């Protein structure tokens, strides 16, 4: 049986993420906005479950809970076209409306307010799920909402679910962008704290990164949260589409992550995706081939992933796997190795074994792909310490420099000091270097 | 209407030991069931069986 | 030549030729990744277990797997998943620890008619087994 | 011949939801309010008799008795479309019209005083009916006079037919909100002590969860009183439902019944129903799937007995018979297996045989289903018991504080001592701890 994931959509940003990501399944899998399987969406091979769950044999209902300290987002995801996807009854909204104050600590503890509410809505979304695995929460850490409330929900499903993974999408503030967020270093802080407290496994997103992206290859000037949401929910979908589309590989997450997660510290993942295209550059079905998908997925435009220039670190990935759905042929990937080897297109780990992993996976029938071949890499790059590394210097500065902590003063947590950020900054800085250590051959004997 | 005590407890044993009867029948019954289920991977004759077993009282004393 | 292409034309439309090789697909190659999955998982729960052939291979947790496995899968009711079977080559004793081909004893046969059975003969059915 | 059933309608609340009932089997057996079989009930497959009683050789009569303390509410029977349904005698209204004051002792002492009256009722429709299987109560737990006059209408059924078996619909008042009827809780505790003592099964008919129900299936924000009474007829007749459609098997009420009581202290049953819809949400036909159906029916927000979420006892069905009807795909069944059990959504009983019996109907043509395809669950689950339990100890705490009882005083039942009320709570917690016991192996040794 499927692996199901339970989405946890947390402030603005997790808030505009979730609603993507639902428009996007959707869209695949032929559903109506509001839940309802459109009739041209006779391909009954979505899975569905992993992500939604059938209120009834019509109405597909996301296994979504949305938590939020800040109204306005709940508000947005009510006049988004994914407000019929959620339950309403799995949908928390503040009743007091004031937010967080972009203050990660009031966030948290409005999701401790409203814990035994949004626990009951993930767990409502669970018995929807015939096999649900554990809870991935996509949320921001810049924010306050979206910070605290991502903070909470990932707590409250490690209490609810103590023997079940908990992954979290953890999106981190860009540092190439003026947060409005000036917050958003200590709220990451406390973020990549809970991730590292009641998590097991924090992917590590960049807004950066997908800033980068948006500007180089989407073409737009200034991402927004709510874009660069957008970006991370069609990344997870294209990740997810073989977990929905059940074939004759990567049937489940653990065949897909086993490569990339070495250890359970080392848990710090990077991304990649091959053949990179615009939204808006749909038009030209271009024929990539496994040898073109690789020189593109060597182009930084497409990593999303923002790792600084360490000039004294020589970072690199350990391994890489990349599966690959559409239409491939064997012997183009054969042509790309050969390709990558001649140009020693990738560095692996010396002290293991590590190669390229493909998974085949199939395209939704109702969805067109603008893509012949379409690939998501998971791999596991020391360069991803980079981005770890920087939310760690990004929180040490604004907690060394008490910025916008009146804001986060309000809360109790963070109201006479940051220590709390500050820890969480060394936490994620000895995360940061143990996926480094992880590209070296002493990570043998790592911890 | 309640020695009536005693009549309504020999009574219940009697039909105690009726319905170990029974269920020893049924139990049987139920068996070559699930060995037909079993047999065939028919998940119609699971359905059945769980229609008939839902409690799963049968299920036990078939395996008995 | 008309013969040929009559043949050609009867075994594609009237004996489904396609038809058996989408099912061959579905069910033999694991299509349904639902059903793989709860298969996988079953397998590797029993072997990791110690369970023996007789324990495992019993048609009563064989035909619960599947049904599980069916019921998991997106296309676990359709037809073409209702022509697999699981089926014993031998009964193990014992299920030997570590070793890879413990699960060597499970075959999936493919039933064909005639004529297909002079197309897809017994031994490629057991070459898909 | 069909089991027929004869309803007692006590006070004002408990008279409109046995009129919600009677209409309710009426439109299922194509009866209309006048008593005439409808053209369209061609489907002669229906028992009118579980429901009707014929009073002459044309007139089919519902088995319905109207008993109230206040006039005004049988007054409004007899001005209502169903004043031809009911038969005349079995309408006893006060003189003096006072009701019973919100007094759960005031409503037994009118239904005392109305004993002759009601009992003639139960008499004229055991033998209107060819094979009269026992009567079902329906009133409310909450007020004075449905309480107290259904708990004496159940006291005269199982006086009148004591070899009979009497499978009640008692719906019991929330614990949980406080009433505006300070004595509802000793009601409360009546009519649960009058369930378990004359019935042989009890759905329990949470107001609260009627809402909940309303708000969360049938979409309605704020459920009327009136709406409240059509999701308890909706319990007592999914409770019914093997009495009043014949097949194969469960043809009586004491067949039914059976399967879901054990023993007989521990038949406090909870009821749920899926989907549920009220009656203005007929437009959506929702696809309901097998497993939404199930779910729904396991879920509290959706069971006519609202049962907290106890996290660490596992509250059980005693036993569980689905009647469903429409278009069902095998592999969904088992899906939705799959999901109960990985969610755990039902408990069965481990003490005793308990399964689903399956008949196969054709569906009557007069009742619009608002469902494809519709199945009721009548089922015995130790989850009523939590009602039960709260009911008794709301009624404890109202009698240790006198509440209420000077309206109870009034009348010669109460004029003394609350002695009553005390054995009220202490039968309805009887109860709740045996239908609590049924969901455990050790329920054979229940009431020892």
């Known amino acids: 049986m499927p692996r199901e994931i339970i989405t946890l959509q947390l402030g603005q940003c997790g808030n505009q993420i979730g609603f993507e990501f639902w428009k996007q399944l959707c869209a695949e899998h032929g559903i109506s906005p509001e839940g309802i399987v459109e009739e041209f969406a006779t391909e009954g091979t979505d899975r569905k479950d992993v992500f939604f769950y059938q209120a009834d044999d019509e109405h597909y209902i996301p296994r979504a809970v949305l938590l939020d300290l800040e109204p306005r987002v709940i508000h947005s995801i009510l006049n988004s076209p994914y407000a019929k996807l959620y339950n309403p009854e799995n949908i928390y909204l503040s009743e007091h409306g004031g937010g967080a104050g972009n203050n990660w600590a009031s966030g948290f503890s409005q999701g401790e307010k409203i814990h035994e509410d949004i626990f009951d809505i993930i767990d409502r979304e669970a018995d929807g799920s015939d096999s649900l695995e554990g809870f991935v929460l996509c949320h921001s850490i810049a924010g306050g909402t979206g910070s605290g409330l991502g903070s909470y929900l990932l707590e409250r499903l490690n209490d609810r679910y103590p023997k079940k993974l908990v992954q979290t999408y953890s999106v981190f503030p860009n540092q190439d962008e003026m947060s409005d967020v000036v917050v958003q270093p200590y709220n990451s802080l406390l973020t990549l704290k809970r991730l590292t407290q009641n998590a097991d496994c924090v992917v590590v997103l960049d807004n950066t990164a997908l800033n980068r992206i948006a500007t180089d290859r989407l073409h737009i000037q200034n991402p927004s949260f709510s874009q660069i949401n957008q970006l991370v929910s069609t990344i997870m979908s294209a990740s997810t589409t073989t977990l929905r589309y059940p074939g004759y590989m990567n049937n489940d997450l653990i065949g897909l992550i086993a490569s990339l997660i070495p250890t359970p510290r080392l848990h710090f993942l990077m991304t990649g995706y091959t053949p990179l295209t615009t939204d808006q550059s749909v038009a030209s079905v271009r024929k990539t081939t496994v040898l073109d998908v690789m020189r593109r997925l060597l182009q930084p435009k497409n990593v999303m992933v923002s790792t600084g220039r360490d000039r004294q670190t020589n970072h690199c990935y350990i391994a890489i796997l990349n599966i690959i759905q559409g239409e491939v042929d064997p012997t183009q990937v054969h042509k790309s190795l050969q390709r990558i080897r001649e140009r020693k297109l990738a560095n692996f780990i010396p002290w293991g074994p590590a190669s390229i992993q493909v998974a085949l996976s199939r395209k939704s029938p109702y969805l067109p792909s603008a893509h012949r071949v379409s690939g998501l890499m998971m791999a596991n790059h020391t360069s991803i310490s980079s981005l770890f590394e920087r939310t760690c210097r990004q929180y040490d500065k604004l907690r060394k420099r008490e910025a916008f902590l009146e804001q986060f003063r309000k809360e109790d947590m963070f109201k006479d000091n940051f220590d709390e950020m500050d820890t969480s900054r060394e936490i994620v800085q000895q995360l940061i270097d143990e996926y480094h250590a992880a590209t070296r051959p002493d990570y043998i004997s790592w911890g | 209407l309640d020695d009536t005590v005693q009549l309504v407890s020999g009574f219940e044993a009697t039909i105690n030991k009726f319905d170990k009867n029974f269920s020893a029948h049924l139990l049987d019954l139920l068996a070559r069931l699930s060995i037909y289920s079993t047999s065939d991977c028919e998940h119609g004759m699971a359905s059945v069986i769980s229609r008939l077993d839902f409690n799963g009282f049968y299920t036990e004393r078939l395996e008995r | ?129």
């Not at chain 3, 075994?11 to 090789?21: D, I, N, P, R």
């Not at chain 3, 990744?33 to 729960?45: K, P, T, Y």
């Not at chain 3, 030997?96 to 017994?122: F, G, M, Q």
């Open chain 3, 1 to 129: 030549s008309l013969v040929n292409k009559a043949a050609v034309d009867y075994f594609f439309v009237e004996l489904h030729l396609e038809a058996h090789y989408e099912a061959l697909r579905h069910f033999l190659l694991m299509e349904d990744g639902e059903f793989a999955q709860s298969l996988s998982d079953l397998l590797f729960e029993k072997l990791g277990a110690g369970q023996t052939p007789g324990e495992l291979l019993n048609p009563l947790v064989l035909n619960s797997v599947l049904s599980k496995a069916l019921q998991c899968s997106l296309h676990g009711d359709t037809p073409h998943a209702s022509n697999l079977s699981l089926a014993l080559k031998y009964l193990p004793e014992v299920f030997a620890p570590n070793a890879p081909d413990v699960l060597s004893c499970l075959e999936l046969r493919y039933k064909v008619d005639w004529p297909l059975n002079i197309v897809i003969t017994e031994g490629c059915l057991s070459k898909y087994s």
